[PDB]
Design a protein around this ligand. Structure first.
Ligand SMILES: *[C@@H]1O[C@H](CO)[C@@H](O[C@@H]2O[C@H](CO)[C@@H](O)[C@H](O)[C@H]2NC(C)=O)[C@H](O)[C@H]1NC(C)=O
Ligand SMILES: *[C@@H]1O[C@H](CO)[C@@H](O[C@@H]2O[C@H](CO)[C@@H](O)[C@H](O)[C@H]2NC(C)=O)[C@H](O)[C@H]1NC(C)=O
Ligand code: NAG
Ligand code: NAG
Ligand code: NAG
Ligand code: NAG
Ligand code: NAG
Ligand code: NAG
Ligand code: NAG
Ligand code: NAG
Ligand code: NAG
Ligand code: ZN
Length: 860
């Protein structure tokens, strides 16, 4: 029986370095194992308890200091926690380095987790092989026996003997390689800096490269040869972002090398590794001419994310997974924070803003879970990998860093960085580096533990009565009894009174009610500047009709982030009931004079949730009258859009937003303009450039014709550009021919012309529009069994198939059906977070109709 009945390893033994030698042949999917672990005892144990899985071990056994002579112990194992224990020939006395050596058999993974391998086809013919690693969170132990926790850091020599052609890559630069007798090469890499078991990485496959030397460290993007041509932007961007993390962290990237790799597969594990960043082929390949704003915006942030992860996560790692949200939260913040100081032209705050919106309305559900609390098993380690925690974390740092200065934020960041580099940490340690705020401690970061420890976010009510600012707080709950919900809240607020002179100020509300005194007597006040604070603000009734009046006068007295914030808020409140729906729509009656994208898209987002909810109920006429009045507010901006790619990113994303609003709903010249552009494009065997900005729109309109449908289907199964094939798939699923809509899903499910990864994106698209709406949900239930086979229950795709099939229902008849269907298979499924959040969204719609179907009749 085995000497350790816990899931965490013992504090008994500690690794100091790892030495690893491996023979995978990619052709037969098998490999050599050999690990030498230079450990060290800190307390007496008869065993070394450590992690190992899937290893068929031949010979293993144990040294001391003292002797280069080695002596035979035998392994005991325990597969339930992945652990193995070596029964030591003699007592590990405290303070002594011993070294441990393991030989093993193993299989190369055929999933895409751990040490995995796959095949792909060439431009010229050919069957190529390839293998890589993906060790988060607990996968390293599958490749090689080790202390697989993030606290147990160490140093690494990895050496991999690989056939002549393949380029072997790994963390540290390749020190040496030496020809072996059969035709095989032996690659050895430098010993690694101190780093965590999960960050180890190594690649075997036929690539080329493209390099540049920022200062001392040299940056290179590795891709399969085909077109290493288009890693040119990736390369140039890693470069400026590299000496953008730079100086700001005031720490220098410790490695001599930094290599990014475009792995040639769609299920590629893309991750953080030090000196060996992975990506899916798709997310890196970019082309100045044929590729849109979306895929630059996306490739720029994807780089900027895994780059800050260098400092955050690798350099300074978690004690344990209970704090993952911190790094991924911080990285996600940097991703949006670097960009708007190097690439201020992308308007990457807009992405950010909307990202925060969608964060809050799922942080407002009751399915929500506060981001920090004890983890103890691994369904609890991978439950932490939902990007809701990441984005919320991200939101907190922007709120923390605009309350404290950006400078104050920086040094406390920098001060955080220096104090425990190469070390493991817990959450509160960052809050302490901050409490070296001020000359040294003027307020505590007990503040941040109110946000971390409680689900949801405060609703801040503001009333104002001639002197004043009466500020009160409660949890934003979506209705039908606990109150130790209290937040420490930075209250940015901006006003205007006297002379058109904008006064803005900060103040931290740390009790249930409070009050701030303004200097002048204003006509309007706005709370939460640029939505810097993660919360919703509700006003008393002629404080709301102050701002709206003010928006019809001169709205540009506010930012576009503020304006977008009111539109967000006023609509979500009128959902919760705290405002009539008709004063949301009088807020956006402003929009005749709007020119910034951020508020227009957010209003268009809102109005079209309303459009679709109505449309799925029978109330089609109400729905249609709704959009045409949005259309009329935005009528000039719509026509003045040119069907082009010309302009600032912001004004391009606006252009693409306005143009397929007007087209989705057939409003004005727009559908025709588009359908000429489609015939020209289709005339030309595809051989004509569509402005990528109007490309998804042009495709939709054409997908509405059996001629057009069948063309675009040929272009899907033929053309190479995976970017444009999702704007084609989209269209194919924006048909209203039900038989096709079914056949798309039926086929994506069977992996026929569309790989099964895309079905979740198909299903969401079919069901979102009236003709497919019931068809989607029925597909989801008619093949539920085969849906659980290829997406493991609770995974982020069975996620969406239920979210995106059902989130539009609004009748208690439907509600019953959804719940009757899910309980009717399993109760273990029936109380999945995904499933009763699915159910939770549906009554919120019923509630929404119950309060706002309304009287849509007397207006609208
Ligand atoms: C995996 O096993 C195969 C088969 O033993 C090894 O194969 C050879 O591949 C080279 C080219 O890469 C050919 O020139 C040889 O003729 C092949 N030999 C045979 C017997 O098929 C392969 O090298 C092994 N992989 C590794 C990494 O050692
Ligand atoms: C990536 O390709 C580049 C060519 O664009 C290689 O660059 C030179 O590589 C040789 C080979 O070691 C060096 O001796 C030269 O010093 C490099 N050029 C300069 C200006 O320094 C690069 O080596 C390739 N990547 C790898 C890993 O070899
Ligand atoms: C783990 C640790 O040392 N924490 C302390 C913290 O308790 C203290 O308040 C702070 C003051 O700067 O210094 C640090
Ligand atoms: C691996 O395969 C089995 C154990 O599952 C055993 O018969 C065989 O000898 C093992 N190979 C080595 C090299 O230990
Ligand atoms: C080896 O052990 C000694 C004490 O036994 C310790 O002082 C030393 O640091 C260890 N070696 C390394 C490289 O740390
Ligand atoms: C690889 O998988 C086979 C089953 O397909 C198993 O018998 C074998 O033991 C595995 N290899 C190791 C090292 O466990
Ligand atoms: C290059 O050299 C060192 C990096 O170690 C740094 O002090 C210096 O500022 C760097 N300069 C630039 C332009 O990156
Ligand atoms: C170092 O960490 C300790 C926690 O023991 C903390 O109190 C201290 O403020 C940190 N110092 C810096 C400069 O971050
Ligand atoms: C607000 O004004 C009153 C005096 O009119 C003062 O007593 C109170 O402390 C002020 N509050 C703040 C937060 O400045
Ligand atoms: C948008 O608002 C008005 C134009 O109606 C103008 O004052 C303002 O500068 C415009 N901003 C941009 C970026 O065009
Ligand atoms: C259209 O182009 C494809 C290559 O992308 C080619 O295979 C096909 O035969 C062409 N069609 C015609 C009618 O020439
Ligand atoms: Zn990340």
């Amino acid at each position: 029986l085995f000497p350790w009945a816990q899931i965490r390893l013992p504090t008994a033994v500690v690794p100091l370095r790892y030495e690893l030698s491996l023979h995978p042949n990619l052709t037969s999917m098998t490999f050599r194992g050999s690990v030498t672990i230079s450990v060290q005892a800190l307390q007496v144990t008869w065993n070394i308890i450590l992690h190992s899985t899937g290893h068929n071990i031949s010979r293993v056994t144990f040294m001391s200091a003292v002797s280069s002579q080695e002596k035979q112990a035998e392994i005991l194992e325990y597969a339930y926690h992945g652990q193995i224990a070596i029964v030591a020939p003699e007592a590990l006395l405290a303070g002594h380095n011993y070294t441990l050596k393991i030989e093993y058999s193993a299989n190369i993974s055929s999933s895409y987790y751990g040490f995995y391998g796959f095949s792909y086809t060439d431009e010229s013919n050919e069957k190529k092989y390839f293998a890589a690693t993906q060790f988060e969170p607990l996968a390293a132990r599958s490749a090689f026996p080790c202390f697989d926790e993030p606290a147990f850091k160490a140093t690494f020599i990895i050496k991999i003997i690989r056939d002549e052609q393949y380029t072997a890559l790994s963390n540290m630069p390749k020190k040496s390689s030496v020809v072996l007798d059969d035709g095989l090469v032996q690659d050895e890499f430098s010993e690694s800096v101190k780093m965590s078991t999960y960050l180890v990485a190594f690649i075997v496959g036929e690539m080329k490269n493209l390099s540049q030397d920022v200062n001392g460290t040299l940056v290179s993007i590795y891709a399969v040869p085909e077109k290493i041509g288009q890693v040119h932007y990736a390369l140039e961007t890693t470069v400026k972002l590299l000496e953008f993390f730079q100086n700001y962290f005031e720490i220098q990237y410790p490695l001599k090398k930094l290599d990014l790799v475009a792995i040639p597969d769609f299920e590629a594990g893309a991750m953080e590794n030090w000196g060996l960043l992975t990506f899916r082929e798709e997310t890196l390949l970019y082309d100045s001419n044929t590729s849109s704003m979306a895929d630059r915006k996306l490739v720029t942030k994807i780089i900027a994310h895994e780059l800050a992860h260098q400092w955050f996560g690798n350099l300074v790692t978690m004690k344990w997974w209970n704090d993952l949200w911190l790094n991924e939260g911080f990285a996600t913040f940097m991703e949006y924070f670097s960009l708007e100081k190097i690439f201020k032209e992308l308007s990457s705050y807009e992405d950010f803003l909307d990202a925060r919106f969608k964060t809050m309305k799922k942080d407002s559900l009751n399915s929500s879970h506060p981001i920090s609390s004890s983890v103890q098993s691994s369904e609890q380690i991978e439950e932490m990998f939902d990007s809701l925690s990441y984005f919320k974390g991200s939101s907190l740092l922007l709120m923390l860093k605009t309350y404290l200065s950006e400078d104050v934020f920086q040094h406390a960041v920098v001060l955080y960085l220096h104090n425990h580099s190469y070390a493991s940490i817990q959450s509160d340690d960052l809050w302490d580096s901050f409490n070296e705020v001020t000359n040294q401690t003027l307020d505590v970061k007990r503040m941040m533990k109110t946000w971390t420890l409680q689900k949801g976010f405060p609703l801040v009510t503001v009333q104002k009565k001639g002197k004043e600012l009466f500020i009160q707080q409660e949890r934003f709950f979506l209705n039908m009894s606990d109150t130790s919900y209290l937040w420490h809240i930075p209250l940015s607020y901006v006003t205007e009174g006297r002379n058109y002179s904008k006064y803005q100020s900060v103040s931290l509300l740390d009790k249930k009610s409070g009050v701030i005194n303004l200097t002048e007597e204003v006509l309007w006040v706005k709370v939460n500047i640029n939505m810097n604070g993660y919360y919703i603000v509700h006003y008393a009734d002629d404080d709301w009709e102050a701002l709206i009046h003010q928006l019809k006068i001169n709205p540009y007295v506010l930012s576009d982030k503020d304006r977008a914030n009111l539109i967000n808020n006023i609509f979500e409140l009128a959902g919760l009931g705290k405002v009539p729906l008709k004063r949301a729509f009088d807020l956006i009656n402003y929009l005749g004079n709007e020119n910034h994208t951020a508020p227009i898209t957010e209003a268009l987002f809102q109005t079209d949730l309303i459009y679709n909810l109505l449309e799925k109920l029978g109330y089609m006429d109400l729905a249609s009258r709704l959009v045409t009045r949005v259309f009329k507010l935005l009528q000039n901006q719509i026509q003045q859009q040119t069907w082009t790619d010309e302009g600032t990113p912001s004004m391009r994303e606006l252009r693409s937003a306005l143009l397929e609003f007007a087209c989705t709903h057939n409003l004005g010249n727009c559908s025709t303009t588009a359908m000429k552009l489609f015939d020209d494009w289709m005339a030309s065997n595809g051989t004509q450039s569509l402005p990528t900005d109007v490309m998804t729109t042009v495709f939709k309109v054409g997908a509405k014709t059996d001629k057009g449908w069948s063309f675009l289907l040929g272009k899907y199964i033929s053309i190479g550009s995976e970017a444009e094939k999702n704007k084609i798939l989209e269209a194919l699923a924006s048909s209203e021919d039900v038989r096709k809509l079914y056949w798309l899903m039926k086929s994506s499910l069977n992996g026929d012309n569309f790989r099964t990864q895309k079905l979740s994106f198909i299903i969401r698209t079919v069901g979102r529009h009236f003709p497919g709406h019931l068809l989607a949900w029925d597909f989801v239930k008619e093949n539920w069994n085969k849906l659980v086979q290829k997406f493991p229950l609770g995974s982020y795709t069975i996620q969406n198939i239920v979210a995106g099939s059902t989130y539009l229902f609004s009748t208690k008849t439907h509600l019953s059906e959804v719940q009757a269907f899910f309980e009717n298979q399993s109760e273990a499924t029936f109380r999945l977070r995904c499933v009763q959040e699915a159910l939770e969204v549906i009554q919120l719609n019923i509630q929404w109709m119950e309060k706002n179907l309304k009287s849509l009749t007397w207006w609208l």
